[PDB]
C-alpha cells in the first residue's frame, strides 16, 4: 500500500542511476551485478529488478557483442523469495524473447556488515532498511542509560536531550558501518540507491518524526496502567531504529569519504489510506502494516501473548484518539556513486 | 548419511589434487575465486573449508594478496585466513545458473545421476508398458528400457556439461562424484539392487491387493547408474571438458560393522526410505509407505541375509578446455 507508493516515487531515481552506469559503459561488462539489500520491500523488489532487466535489454539490443547477463543478489534469503526467483529467473520464465539472462541468488546475513567479495557489486538497491540500527543506541543501554528515556521507546518530547543525541550517534556509527562495508564491495563508479524512513523537522521529538513509536509507547503504557505489562520494560526498552533528516544523512555520507552524493531528496506521503472512508478500516490497515514491521522487535520485548491486545489498543488510539489522521511520513532518496578508487 | 561420509573422504584427495591444479596456473593472484556446489546433499561445509585451507597455503607460498572465496550453493534435496562468502542458488543444475565465465571450481556429489525425468519412451504399440513389474532396469526388462535410460542420462548429463561449459572459466575445474556401476550390464544386482528390491516389495503389496498393478507397471525412477565407459563417452562427445581423472571405487552398502542383521538391515532401509520415498510417494501415496519399507526390510534381512552388493561411486575430474 504505502510501500507501493514509496517504491514508485523512487523508481525514477533508480532509472537515472542505471542510466549513469550506462554512461560509464557498465552495459558493456560481461555481466551486470545488482544487489537488493534488506529485501523486506518487496513484492516491490520484483519491480526494481524487472526495471534493471528491461533497461539493459533496451540498451544492449543494438549492440554487436554477445548480450550481457544480469546477476541479482537478494538479501534479508528466508526461502520466500521464490515468488521473486520464479518471476525474475529467465530460465524459469523461459521467455525466448528476452536476450538478457537473469540469474537470481540469495545472500544470507546482515546488510549492516560485509556480504560480498571486494569489487563484486555494480548496483545496490535498498529500500526502508538503512534506517534500522544494529541495536538500541549504546548510550541508552548502559546501566545508567536504561533510565534516561522513561515512558517511551524512542525519541520523544518527554525525552531528555541525551536520548536524541544517543540515537544520532548510534545512527552515525551504524550507517557508517554500512557505507564502509559497501565501499569495499561496490566497484569504482558503481551506484547505490538507498531509500529510508526519515523526517522533515530538525527536531527529532517532533510528532511527524516519531508518531508511530510514540503511539506504540502510549499503547504499551495503557496496558502497563491496566497492570498487564511490567513497565520495566517500557522504561528500559528503546527501539533499534532512527529516522534521520536530510542534513544528517548528507553529513554522514560526506564525512565518510567513499561515496559521492548524486542525489539527495526527501518527499512526503500520507501515512494512512486517506481515500478510505471507514475510519476504522483506515487505521486498521495502517496498524496492520505497522504490526508487520514492528512485531518482531516488540513481541521479543513484551511476549507474544500480549501482541493482540497491544496492537488493538494501538488501532483504537489511531482511530478514536486521532480521528484516523496522522502526520505525513518523510522518505529519503539517496543516490550514491563510488569514487575512484 | 554415514555412507556419504565415506564417499567424501575418498574423493577429497581428488578434490585437493584438482583445486591445487588451479594454483599451478595463475589463477593465483586473482581478486576472488568462485566455487559452486551443485546438488549439495555437512560435507558441502567440509569441501568449503578444504578450499579455504588450500588457497591460504598457496598464497603464503606465493607471497601475494589472498583472494576472497565466494561459494554458491545450489540445493537438490575466528583466525581463518581466507574470507569466504556463501550464497544460495535456487534452480535446476541441468540448466544455466551462473553468468558466463564466472566459476573457477564446481563440485557435485551424488546428484548428476538424478534424471530430469524418468525415461520418455517406455510404452510400445500395441500400447503396452515396456517395464512391467518393476521401477528401474531389471533382468525381466526388455532391451528398450536400458536404452531409454541411457538415452535419458545421455541427454541430461550432456545438458549439465553444456550449461557448465558456459559458466566454467577456461582451465577451470569440475569435480563430479556419482552413483555408478561396475558391470557393463545395468541389470546386474550390483547395479540396481535397491530399485529391484523396492519393486519386489511393491509387487508383494500388489498381490495382496493393497497397491494397483496399474501403477507399478507405468512407474519408473528418474535415476540412472552409469558405467565408467558411459560417463567417459558422454563427456568426450560433448567437447567442453578434459577428463583429468576418471575412477570408480567400491563401498559396502550396509553398515557391516554390525553383527545383528535385522538391525543393520533396518539402518539400511531407514537410509533407503529417506532418499527414495519422495521419488515414490506421488505414485504410491505416503499411506502405504510404512508397510512398503517394512516388507522391503524383510526382503533385505531375510531373503538376502543382510548381504547387499557394494555400491560403485564414480569420481570424475574435469577441466574446461580452452
Amino acid at each position: 500500500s504505502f510501500t507501493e507508493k514509496v517504491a514508485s516515487m523512487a523508481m525514477p531515481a533508480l532509472e537515472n542511476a542505471v542510466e549513469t552506469l550506462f554512461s560509464k559503459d557498465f552495459h558493456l561488462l560481461p555481466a551486470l551485478n545488482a544487489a537488493d539489500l534488506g529485501c523486506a520491500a518487496g513484492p516491490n523488489t520484483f519491480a526494481v529488478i524487472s526495471m534493471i532487466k528491461r533497461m539493459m535489454e533496451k540498451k544492449c539490443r543494438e549492440l554487436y557483442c554477445q548480450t550481457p547477463e544480469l546477476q541479482v543478489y537478494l538479501n534479508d534469503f528466508g526461502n520466500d523469495f521464490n515468488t521473486l526467483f520464479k518471476g525474475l529467473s529467465s530460465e524459469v520464465v523461459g521467455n525466448k524473447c528476452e536476450e538478457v539472462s537473469c540469474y537470481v541468488m540469495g545472500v544470507p546475513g546482515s546488510f549492516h556488515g560485509r556480504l560480498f567479495p571486494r569489487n563484486s557489486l555494480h548496483l545496490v538497491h535498498s529500500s526502508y532498511s538503512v534506517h534500522w540500527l544494529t541495536q538500541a543506541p549504546k548510550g541508552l543501554t548502559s546501566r545508567e542509560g536504561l533510565a534516561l528515556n522513561k515512558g517511551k521507546i524512542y525519541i520523544s518530547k518527554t525525552s531528555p536531550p541525551a536520548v536524541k543525541e544517543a540515537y544520532l550517534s548510534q545512527f552515525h556509527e551504524d550507517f557508517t558501518m554500512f557505507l564502509n562495508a559497501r565501499s569495499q564491495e561496490v566497484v569504482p563508479n558503481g551506484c547505490m540507491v538507498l531509500i529510508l524512513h526519515g523526517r522533515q523537522s530538525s527536531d527529532p521529538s517532533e510528532m511527524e518524526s516519531c508518531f508511530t513509536w510514540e503511539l506504540l509507547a502510549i499503547a504499551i503504557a495503557e496496558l502497563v496502567s491496566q497492570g498487564l505489562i511490567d513497565e520495566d520494560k517500557l522504561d528500559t526498552f528503546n527501539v533499534p531504529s532512527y529516522f534521520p533528516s536530510l542534513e544528517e544523512v548528507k553529513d554522514i555520507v560526506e564525512r565518510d569519504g567513499s561515496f559521492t552524493i548524486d542525489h539527495l531528496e526527501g518527499f512526503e506521503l500520507d501515512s494512512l489510506e486517506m481515500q478510505e472512508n471507514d475510519k476504522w478500516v483506515r487505521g486498521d490497515k495502517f496498524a496492520k502494516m505497522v504490526r508487520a514491521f514492528t512485531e518482531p522487535i516488540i513481541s521479543n520485548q513484551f511476549g507474544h501473548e500480549i501482541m493482540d491486545k497491544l496492537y488493538d489498543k494501538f488501532t483504537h488510539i489511531v482511530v478514536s484518539d486521532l480521528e484516523a489522521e496522522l502526520p505525513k511520513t518523510t522518505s529519503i532518496i539517496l543516490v550514491l556513486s563510488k569514487i575512484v578508487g
Side-chain angles (χ1 to χ4, degrees), chain A residues 1-76 78 80-81 84-85 87-95 97-274 276 280 282-284 286-287 289-304 306-318 320-322 324-327 329-341:
Chain A
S1 302
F2 167 83
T3 320
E4 280 182 339
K5 196 65 179 67
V6 179
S8 60
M9 234 66 175
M11 194 55 71
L14 207 232
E15 299 189 45
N16 298 132
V18 172
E19 299 271 57
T20 61
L21 288 185
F22 288 172
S23 74
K24 304 172 169 181
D25 284 354
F26 270 77
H27 66 286
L28 299 180
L29 296 169
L32 194 67
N33 295 336
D36 192 316
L37 302 188
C39 268
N44 308 94
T45 308
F46 177 82
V48 299
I49 292 165
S50 296
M51 247 285 312
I52 301 168
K53 234 264 200 61
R54 179 157 22 92
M55 285 183 68
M56 274 181 303
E57 258 145 8
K58 180 158 193 174
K59 197 79 214 303
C60 298
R61 65 185 306 273
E62 286 181 345
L63 304 184
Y64 285 85
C65 62
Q66 194 174 16
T67 305
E69 308 168 295
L70 178 64
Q71 184 177 32
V72 179
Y73 298 102
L74 306 175
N75 158 256
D76 206 278
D80 63 312
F81 77 140
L84 306 181
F85 153 68
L88 298 163
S89 171
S90 56
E91 284 275 278
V92 173
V93 170
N95 208 212
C97 298
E98 304 173 4
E99 323 88 316
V100 172
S101 301
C102 186
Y103 305 108
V104 184
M105 271 82 175
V107 188
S110 170
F111 70 85
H112 285 127
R114 295 283 305 277
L115 289 180
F116 310 98
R118 293 174 304 263
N119 304 287
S120 52
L121 296 184
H122 303 143
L123 184 60
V124 173
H125 169 270
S126 192
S127 186
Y128 269 58
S129 293
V130 132
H131 60 246
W132 284 105
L133 301 176
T134 57
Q135 59 197 288
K138 297 177 185 187
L140 295 190
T141 67
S142 61
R143 189 53 263 186
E144 50 197 13
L146 295 171
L148 302 190
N149 198 29
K150 304 247 59 61
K152 299 299 162 58
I153 59 175
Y154 187 66
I155 296 171
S156 177
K157 250 73 178 66
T158 62
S159 297
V163 171
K164 64 177 177 185
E165 290 169 356
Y167 265 101
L168 179 50
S169 186
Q170 191 69 45
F171 183 65
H172 185 283
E173 190 175 298
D174 289 344
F175 194 43
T176 289
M177 180 186 184
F178 174 80
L179 291 181
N180 285 341
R182 281 338 129 213
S183 169
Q184 241 48 53
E185 309 166 340
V186 172
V187 125
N189 291 323
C191 272
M192 221 139 71
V193 181
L194 311 181
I195 302 97
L196 59 155
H197 186 342
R199 71 176 192 269
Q200 281 291 329
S201 58
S202 60
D203 174 28
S205 73
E206 195 67 14
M207 198 50 175
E208 144 273 348
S209 161
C210 70
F211 62 93
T212 305
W213 297 135
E214 179 78 22
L215 300 182
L216 266 175
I218 299 178
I220 299 171
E222 289 281 328
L223 306 184
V224 160
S225 43
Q226 299 180 14
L228 296 155
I229 297 186
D230 307 50
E231 190 194 358
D232 220 330
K233 209 100 159 201
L234 212 211
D235 302 324
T236 54
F237 174 62
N238 289 286
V239 140
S241 190
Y242 186 71
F243 304 142
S245 64
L246 278 244
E247 168 178 301
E248 291 176 344
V249 167
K250 173 169 171 286
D251 236 273
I252 294 174
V253 172
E254 284 180 351
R255 282 194 62 185
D256 180 90
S258 313
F259 296 88
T260 286
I261 298 175
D262 296 338
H263 197 86
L264 218 200
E265 182 188 1
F267 64 94
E268 290 178 296
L269 287 175
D270 304 270
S271 300
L272 353 74
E273 268 267 293
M274 294 299 293
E276 185 62 51
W280 181 258
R282 197 198 314 180
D284 190 36
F286 165 74
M289 164 177 300
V290 169
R291 180 167 184 170
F293 284 2
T294 60
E295 182 157 5
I297 58 170
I298 295 308
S299 77
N300 252 232
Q301 285 300 320
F302 305 100
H304 221 86
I306 205 60
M307 297 307 281
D308 277 348
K309 190 189 293 291
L310 174 59
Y311 278 99
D312 177 77
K313 180 73 74 174
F314 179 87
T315 312
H316 275 67
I317 293 174
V318 172
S320 300
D321 304 17
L322 287 185
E325 290 181 359
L326 302 172
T329 294
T330 300
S331 299
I332 303 178
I333 305 180
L334 204 232
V335 189
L336 301 174
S337 288
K338 176 72 170 320
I339 318 174
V340 37

